[PDB]
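Long-time lurker, finally posting.

We've been working with Cruzipain (Trypanosoma cruzi) and I want a structural starting point before designing mutants. I don't trust myself to interpret raw outputs, so I'm hoping someone here can both generate the structure tokens and explain anything notable. Sequence follows.
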Amino acid sequence: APAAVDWRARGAVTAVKDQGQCGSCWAFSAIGNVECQWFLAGHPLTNLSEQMLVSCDKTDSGCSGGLMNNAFEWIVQENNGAVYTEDSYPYASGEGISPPCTTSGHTVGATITGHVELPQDEAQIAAWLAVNGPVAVAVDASSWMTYTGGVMTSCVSEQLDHGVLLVGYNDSAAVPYWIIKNSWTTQWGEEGYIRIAKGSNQCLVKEEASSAVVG
Ligand SMILES: *[C@H](CC(=O)N1C(=O)C=C(OC)[C@@H]1Cc1ccc(-c2ccccc2)cc1)[C@H](CCc1ccccc1)NC(=O)[C@H](CC(C)C)NC(=O)[C@H](CC(C)C)NC(=O)[C@H](C(C)C)N(C)C
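Top reply, 14 upvotes:
Generated this for you. Predicted structure of Cruzipain:
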């Protein structure tokens, strides 16, 4: 696989978002993956709805958390493969209450037929992403309140608890790194992003990586 990949540079990544006072990381990770996999299947880049998943997906638990894998399945199985647009189902859980599910008066912005779950291997994950696009991953983020920039290298880690999006990597660098999109606004980290060290399972980045498939 190439030396460096960065799907923002190829127009595949929408702007950084804000989950607010809601534990919906898993929804933003899932959606940001779709947003990008959609685009890379010949469609134009559209902002899609997290609020759809927080409110309507009952396999997960809205602002008290969930996993990306369940979010992909609910889209497919329960919601007929559809993902509404952010515009026709805007995000409304920033104050901390997820308001109730509404099943109509929206607009479908994208569609999926399923998802793959990548093996627990950084290099295979890297290889895949080089070709197929961004990858939703689980990580330990117990200690990211502190993160101001640079390439996180220490990240000792006891469990998975945050969802985010791999959008790239760079193996030339003295410290090789992943490029990860987060949903805590452009204030946090490097304009909303974080680099973590690639090749030592930093923050448990390999452990629960997956992605949607647009048919
Ligand atoms: C999103 C993650 C999140 O937003 N944050 C972090 O993980 C770290 C952050 O800031 C530094 C942000 C905000 C944050 C900060 C601090 C806490 C905290 C602090 C002290 C004690 C408790 C909590 C929480 C969040 C969400 C957060 C879910 C959440 C919301 C409120 C309270 C606790 C947890 N994370 C998830 O949705 C994850 C994402 C997966 C991809 C790993 N999912 C989970 O955490 C599981 C969701 C299930 C399906 C409910 N959790 C579990 O499985 C656990 C384990 C121990 C079995 N269950 C609930 C017991």
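Before you design anything, note these points.
Residues 23, 25-26, 61, 64-68, 138, 141, 144-145, 160-163 surround 83E (CB under 6 Å).
Residues 1-215 form one domain.
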